[PDB]
Amino acid sequence: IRQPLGMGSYTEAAKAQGLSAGRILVAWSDLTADEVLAGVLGVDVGAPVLQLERVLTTDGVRVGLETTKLPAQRYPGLRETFDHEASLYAEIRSRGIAFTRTVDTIDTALPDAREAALLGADARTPMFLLNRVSYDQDDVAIEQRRSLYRGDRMTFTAVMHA
Amino acid sequence: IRQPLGMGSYTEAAKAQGLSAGRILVAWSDLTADEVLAGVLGVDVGAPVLQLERVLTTDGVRVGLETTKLPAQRYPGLRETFDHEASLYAEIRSRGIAFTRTVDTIDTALPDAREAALLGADARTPMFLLNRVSYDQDDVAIEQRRSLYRGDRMTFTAVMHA
């Protein structure tokens, strides 16, 4: 699977290029933001954080493990009502939030044993590790998202013009 | 090192940002183009191809292994005169050839023993495997470039706007 780097969800993007794709819940977790995460999200140190962790499939195989950290206060009732199998991105937009800017870091790493088990991967195999912070129309952070993608099932691409 | 994705050379980008950067020669090689590479460069099967392989350094340490395949006919005198410690991109521009469009694929990979030895890396370490074709102002191919970067030394970044 060859995926242009993009602002939109890659699950939705895979759906677009005419492929099957989906999301499998791993866990919701209630966290409180440490100094680092508080700074990233622009919330108080100790603020509630809602974490959604999912396995991502495409073309009926596992391709990624996505861990999204949300400032809980921005999202009343999300954990109670969100269909974790739907598009998180669309739900947030539905809440009057526009994905205005995204800052992505692209790393490469070996999965830990838990990540490797969730993805059906050999732990020796390198994975893409993407980390994203997205910002809304007022430049308030929406989410911090970590995506671990199987190196053998994903190629990212970029076309650039002078 | 955090490096924005971009069309410019990453070695030069590091120097533009105030870091030391440089290149070490591994080898120049005379190849002829087979069917796949003839296709990529827009040249005839058997056309001469000049390969430049260099180790790239930044902030004093080895960060990547670059293997650049050039249609030799486009660059008279390059092997014997080009200073391999200097910017190949700038030499190509000084010859009147503008980097106008790039097509990059971004993969993750483990190095082979030779690649690992040249990079001073453990062969269990994840690497970025980048492959690029660049095209000039007349959409004529300039090079095909394979870059293998140490995952523990490089992080790529992208910022995107709605």
Short mmCIF file of C-alpha atoms in Angstrom, two decimals:
data_model
loop_
_atom_site.label_atom_id
_atom_site.label_comp_id
_atom_site.label_asym_id
_atom_site.label_seq_id
_atom_site.Cartn_x
_atom_site.Cartn_y
_atom_site.Cartn_z
CA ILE A 1 0.00 0.00 0.00
CA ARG A 2 1.36 3.34 -1.18
CA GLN A 3 0.14 6.37 0.78
CA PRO A 4 0.71 10.06 -0.03
CA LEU A 5 1.51 11.98 3.15
CA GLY A 6 -1.65 13.93 3.92
CA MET A 7 -3.68 15.87 6.48
CA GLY A 8 -6.66 13.54 6.19
CA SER A 9 -6.97 10.19 7.97
CA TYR A 10 -4.99 7.49 6.13
CA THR A 11 -7.79 5.04 6.91
CA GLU A 12 -10.23 7.26 4.97
CA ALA A 13 -7.55 7.80 2.30
CA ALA A 14 -7.21 4.02 1.88
CA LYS A 15 -11.01 3.90 1.61
CA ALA A 16 -10.88 6.55 -1.14
CA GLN A 17 -8.29 4.76 -3.33
CA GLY A 18 -10.90 1.93 -3.40
CA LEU A 19 -9.62 -0.33 -0.61
CA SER A 20 -11.21 -1.93 2.45
CA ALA A 21 -10.16 -0.29 5.70
CA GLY A 22 -11.28 -0.18 9.31
CA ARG A 23 -10.52 0.33 12.99
CA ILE A 24 -10.58 -2.18 15.85
CA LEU A 25 -10.78 -0.92 19.44
CA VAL A 26 -7.94 -1.82 21.70
CA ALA A 27 -8.83 0.39 24.73
CA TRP A 28 -10.11 3.72 25.92
CA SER A 29 -8.04 5.02 28.83
CA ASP A 30 -8.49 7.95 31.18
CA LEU A 31 -5.22 9.82 31.70
CA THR A 32 -4.13 13.06 33.30
CA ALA A 33 -1.71 15.22 31.30
CA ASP A 34 1.92 15.30 32.45
CA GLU A 35 4.05 18.45 32.02
CA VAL A 36 5.08 17.42 28.49
CA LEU A 37 1.61 16.46 27.24
CA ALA A 38 0.04 19.51 28.97
CA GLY A 39 2.42 21.71 26.97
CA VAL A 40 1.76 19.91 23.67
CA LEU A 41 -2.02 20.15 24.10
CA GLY A 42 -2.04 23.59 25.78
CA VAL A 43 -3.99 22.42 28.82
CA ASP A 44 -3.29 22.45 32.60
CA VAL A 45 -0.74 19.99 34.03
CA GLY A 46 -3.12 17.37 35.54
CA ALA A 47 -5.97 18.09 33.10
CA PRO A 48 -8.06 14.99 32.11
CA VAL A 49 -6.88 13.31 28.89
CA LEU A 50 -8.94 10.74 27.00
CA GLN A 51 -6.84 8.19 25.07
CA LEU A 52 -8.32 6.17 22.26
CA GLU A 53 -6.16 3.24 21.04
CA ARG A 54 -7.09 1.33 17.90
CA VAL A 55 -5.71 -1.22 15.44
CA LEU A 56 -5.98 -0.03 11.82
CA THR A 57 -6.63 -2.44 8.98
CA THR A 58 -6.50 -1.97 5.24
CA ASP A 59 -7.39 -4.45 2.55
CA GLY A 60 -8.39 -6.76 5.37
CA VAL A 61 -4.92 -6.91 7.00
CA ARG A 62 -3.50 -5.15 10.11
CA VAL A 63 -1.26 -2.21 9.15
CA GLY A 64 -1.06 0.12 12.11
CA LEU A 65 -1.56 0.85 15.77
CA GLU A 66 -2.96 4.32 16.49
CA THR A 67 -2.89 5.94 19.94
CA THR A 68 -4.74 9.29 20.13
CA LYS A 69 -4.57 11.53 23.17
CA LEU A 70 -7.41 14.05 23.48
CA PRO A 71 -8.03 16.87 25.92
CA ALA A 72 -11.09 15.28 27.55
CA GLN A 73 -12.79 18.64 28.23
CA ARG A 74 -12.98 19.50 24.54
CA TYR A 75 -15.03 16.34 23.88
CA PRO A 76 -18.11 15.88 26.11
CA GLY A 77 -19.64 12.41 25.80
CA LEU A 78 -17.08 11.14 23.27
CA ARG A 79 -16.13 7.99 25.21
CA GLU A 80 -19.80 7.20 25.83
CA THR A 81 -21.15 7.68 22.34
CA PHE A 82 -18.36 7.59 19.77
CA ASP A 83 -18.51 4.51 17.53
CA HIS A 84 -14.78 3.60 17.72
CA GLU A 85 -15.21 1.89 14.37
CA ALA A 86 -16.09 5.21 12.71
CA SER A 87 -13.82 8.08 11.63
CA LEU A 88 -12.55 9.96 14.64
CA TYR A 89 -11.56 12.84 12.32
CA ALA A 90 -15.16 13.23 11.01
CA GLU A 91 -16.59 13.13 14.56
CA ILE A 92 -14.29 15.99 15.64
CA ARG A 93 -15.22 18.01 12.51
CA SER A 94 -18.89 17.35 13.34
CA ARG A 95 -18.23 19.01 16.71
CA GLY A 96 -17.44 22.32 14.98
CA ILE A 97 -13.68 21.70 14.82
CA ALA A 98 -11.63 22.27 11.66
CA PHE A 99 -8.28 20.54 11.07
CA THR A 100 -6.39 23.67 10.19
CA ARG A 101 -2.73 22.77 10.75
CA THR A 102 -0.90 19.46 11.42
CA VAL A 103 2.66 18.99 12.57
CA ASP A 104 3.96 15.44 11.87
CA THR A 105 7.25 13.84 12.88
CA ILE A 106 8.29 10.70 10.96
CA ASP A 107 10.49 8.24 12.73
CA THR A 108 11.45 4.61 12.18
CA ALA A 109 11.58 2.17 15.15
CA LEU A 110 11.22 -1.45 16.24
CA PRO A 111 7.87 -2.24 17.89
CA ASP A 112 7.77 -3.35 21.51
CA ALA A 113 6.37 -6.85 22.10
CA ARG A 114 2.83 -5.56 22.81
CA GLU A 115 2.68 -3.45 19.58
CA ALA A 116 4.13 -6.32 17.59
CA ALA A 117 1.50 -8.77 18.98
CA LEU A 118 -1.36 -6.34 18.16
CA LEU A 119 -0.09 -5.93 14.60
CA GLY A 120 0.85 -9.58 13.91
CA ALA A 121 4.41 -8.46 13.22
CA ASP A 122 7.82 -9.80 13.87
CA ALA A 123 9.44 -7.50 16.51
CA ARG A 124 12.66 -7.40 14.42
CA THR A 125 10.83 -5.58 11.67
CA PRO A 126 11.11 -1.80 11.39
CA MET A 127 7.94 0.22 11.61
CA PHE A 128 7.07 3.84 10.76
CA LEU A 129 6.44 5.81 13.90
CA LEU A 130 4.46 8.96 13.11
CA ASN A 131 3.58 11.52 15.76
CA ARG A 132 1.08 14.26 15.05
CA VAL A 133 -0.26 17.36 16.80
CA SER A 134 -3.24 18.88 14.97
CA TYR A 135 -4.58 22.42 15.44
CA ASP A 136 -8.05 23.92 14.90
CA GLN A 137 -9.21 27.15 13.26
CA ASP A 138 -8.17 29.07 16.39
CA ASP A 139 -4.87 27.23 16.65
CA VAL A 140 -6.00 25.27 19.75
CA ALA A 141 -4.61 21.72 19.74
CA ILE A 142 -7.15 19.05 18.78
CA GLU A 143 -5.17 15.86 19.60
CA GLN A 144 -1.74 14.31 19.84
CA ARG A 145 -1.74 11.16 17.68
CA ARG A 146 0.87 8.37 17.54
CA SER A 147 0.65 5.98 14.54
CA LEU A 148 2.86 2.90 14.38
CA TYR A 149 2.72 1.40 10.89
CA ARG A 150 4.11 -1.90 9.67
CA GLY A 151 7.13 -1.23 7.51
CA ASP A 152 6.26 -4.17 5.26
CA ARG A 153 2.68 -3.04 4.56
CA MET A 154 3.13 0.75 4.15
CA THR A 155 5.09 3.07 1.81
CA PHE A 156 4.62 6.83 2.14
CA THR A 157 5.05 9.06 -0.87
CA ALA A 158 5.51 12.71 -1.66
CA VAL A 159 5.47 14.65 -4.90
CA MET A 160 6.95 18.12 -4.70
CA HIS A 161 7.06 20.95 -7.25
CA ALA A 162 9.43 23.90 -7.27
CA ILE B 1 18.47 15.78 13.78
CA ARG B 2 14.97 16.96 12.78
CA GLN B 3 14.69 17.53 9.02
CA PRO B 4 11.70 18.92 7.14
CA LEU B 5 10.82 16.94 4.00
CA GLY B 6 11.74 18.99 0.97
CA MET B 7 13.15 19.19 -2.52
CA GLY B 8 16.52 20.69 -1.51
CA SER B 9 19.40 18.43 -0.46
CA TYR B 10 19.13 17.41 3.23
CA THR B 11 22.90 17.77 3.69
CA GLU B 12 22.67 21.37 2.43
CA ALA B 13 19.54 21.95 4.55
CA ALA B 14 21.55 21.01 7.64
CA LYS B 15 24.28 23.52 6.72
CA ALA B 16 21.63 26.18 6.03
CA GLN B 17 20.39 25.60 9.60
CA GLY B 18 23.91 26.06 11.04
CA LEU B 19 24.93 22.42 11.57
CA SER B 20 28.12 20.92 10.22
CA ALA B 21 27.35 18.54 7.31
CA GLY B 22 29.37 16.83 4.63
CA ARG B 23 29.88 13.81 2.40
CA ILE B 24 32.49 11.04 2.31
CA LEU B 25 33.13 9.22 -0.97
CA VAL B 26 32.48 5.50 -1.01
CA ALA B 27 32.81 4.91 -4.78
CA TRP B 28 32.03 6.14 -8.26
CA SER B 29 30.79 3.34 -10.60
CA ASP B 30 30.16 3.13 -14.36
CA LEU B 31 26.95 1.27 -15.02
CA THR B 32 24.85 0.90 -18.12
CA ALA B 33 21.12 1.28 -17.92
CA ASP B 34 18.99 -1.85 -18.00
CA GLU B 35 15.27 -1.87 -18.80
CA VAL B 36 14.03 -0.59 -15.44
CA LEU B 37 16.57 2.21 -15.01
CA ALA B 38 16.45 3.17 -18.69
CA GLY B 39 12.76 3.59 -18.04
CA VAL B 40 13.23 5.69 -14.95
CA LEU B 41 15.79 8.11 -16.48
CA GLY B 42 14.23 8.35 -19.95
CA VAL B 43 17.33 7.00 -21.72
CA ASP B 44 18.16 4.06 -24.01
CA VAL B 45 18.86 0.57 -22.71
CA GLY B 46 22.64 0.34 -22.39
CA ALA B 47 23.04 4.15 -22.03
CA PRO B 48 25.89 4.99 -19.66
CA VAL B 49 24.98 5.62 -16.00
CA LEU B 50 27.35 7.14 -13.53
CA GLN B 51 26.78 6.06 -9.92
CA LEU B 52 27.98 8.12 -6.97
CA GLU B 53 27.82 6.53 -3.51
CA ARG B 54 28.63 8.68 -0.52
CA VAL B 55 28.29 8.56 3.24
CA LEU B 56 26.52 11.64 4.53
CA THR B 57 27.46 13.21 7.86
CA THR B 58 25.70 15.82 9.99
CA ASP B 59 26.81 17.38 13.29
CA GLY B 60 30.00 15.35 12.99
CA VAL B 61 28.40 11.89 12.81
CA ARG B 62 27.42 9.47 10.00
CA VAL B 63 23.71 9.77 9.22
CA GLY B 64 23.04 8.16 5.88
CA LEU B 65 24.25 6.31 2.82
CA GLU B 66 23.35 7.84 -0.51
CA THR B 67 23.51 6.07 -3.84
CA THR B 68 22.84 8.40 -6.77
CA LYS B 69 22.45 7.09 -10.32
CA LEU B 70 22.93 9.71 -13.06
CA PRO B 71 22.46 9.56 -16.87
CA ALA B 72 26.17 10.09 -17.61
CA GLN B 73 25.57 11.76 -20.98
CA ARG B 74 23.87 14.71 -19.28
CA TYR B 75 27.00 15.52 -17.19
CA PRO B 76 30.25 15.61 -19.26
CA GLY B 77 33.36 15.41 -17.11
CA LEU B 78 31.54 14.96 -13.78
CA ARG B 79 33.39 11.84 -12.44
CA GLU B 80 36.82 13.24 -12.93
CA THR B 81 36.16 16.82 -11.89
CA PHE B 82 33.22 17.02 -9.45
CA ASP B 83 34.42 17.49 -5.86
CA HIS B 84 32.42 14.75 -4.09
CA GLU B 85 32.64 16.63 -0.76
CA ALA B 86 30.60 19.50 -2.33
CA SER B 87 26.89 19.69 -3.19
CA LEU B 88 25.94 17.52 -6.20
CA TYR B 89 22.62 19.42 -6.39
CA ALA B 90 24.55 22.74 -6.74
CA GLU B 91 26.93 21.29 -9.35
CA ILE B 92 23.91 20.15 -11.32
CA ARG B 93 22.37 23.67 -11.02
CA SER B 94 25.69 25.30 -12.08
CA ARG B 95 25.34 23.18 -15.24
CA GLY B 96 21.97 24.89 -15.88
CA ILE B 97 19.70 22.11 -14.71
CA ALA B 98 16.87 23.05 -12.33
CA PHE B 99 15.29 20.69 -9.83
CA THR B 100 11.68 21.20 -10.79
CA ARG B 101 9.72 18.17 -9.68
CA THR B 102 10.64 15.38 -7.22
CA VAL B 103 8.85 12.06 -6.63
CA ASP B 104 9.88 10.47 -3.30
CA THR B 105 8.92 7.16 -1.75
CA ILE B 106 9.63 6.69 1.97
CA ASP B 107 10.16 3.16 3.29
CA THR B 108 11.66 1.66 6.45
CA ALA B 109 14.29 -1.06 6.20
CA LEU B 110 17.08 -2.88 8.00
CA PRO B 111 20.52 -2.34 6.54
CA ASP B 112 22.60 -5.11 5.03
CA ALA B 113 26.01 -5.75 6.67
CA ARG B 114 27.87 -3.55 4.13
CA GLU B 115 25.46 -0.65 4.58
CA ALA B 116 25.59 -1.09 8.34
CA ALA B 117 29.43 -1.09 8.35
CA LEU B 118 29.66 2.10 6.30
CA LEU B 119 27.16 3.81 8.67
CA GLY B 120 28.69 2.51 11.87
CA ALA B 121 25.22 1.09 12.72
CA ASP B 122 24.07 -2.16 14.33
CA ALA B 123 22.41 -4.16 11.61
CA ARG B 124 19.29 -4.58 13.85
CA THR B 125 18.71 -0.76 13.69
CA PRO B 126 15.73 0.57 11.64
CA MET B 127 16.59 2.89 8.74
CA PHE B 128 14.65 5.21 6.50
CA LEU B 129 14.91 4.00 2.88
CA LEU B 130 14.13 6.99 0.61
CA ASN B 131 13.99 6.70 -3.15
CA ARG B 132 13.72 9.74 -5.36
CA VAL B 133 13.42 10.60 -9.02
CA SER B 134 14.05 14.29 -9.79
CA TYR B 135 13.05 16.09 -13.04
CA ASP B 136 14.35 19.28 -14.53
CA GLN B 137 12.66 22.31 -16.06
CA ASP B 138 11.80 20.29 -19.21
CA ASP B 139 10.59 17.35 -17.16
CA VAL B 140 13.73 15.39 -18.13
CA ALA B 141 15.02 13.13 -15.40
CA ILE B 142 18.06 14.34 -13.50
CA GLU B 143 18.90 11.39 -11.22
CA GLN B 144 17.55 8.44 -9.32
CA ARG B 145 18.64 8.70 -5.66
CA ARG B 146 18.51 6.09 -2.94
CA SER B 147 19.18 7.38 0.57
CA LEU B 148 19.47 5.09 3.59
CA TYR B 149 19.31 7.12 6.85
CA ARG B 150 19.93 5.91 10.40
CA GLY B 151 16.66 5.83 12.27
CA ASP B 152 18.45 6.62 15.50
CA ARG B 153 19.97 9.80 14.04
CA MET B 154 17.31 11.26 11.74
CA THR B 155 13.71 12.36 12.13
CA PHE B 156 11.77 13.82 9.23
CA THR B 157 9.07 16.41 9.68
CA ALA B 158 6.13 17.75 7.77
CA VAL B 159 3.83 20.67 8.48
CA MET B 160 0.60 20.87 6.54
CA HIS B 161 -2.03 23.59 6.25
CA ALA B 162 -5.67 23.44 5.22
#
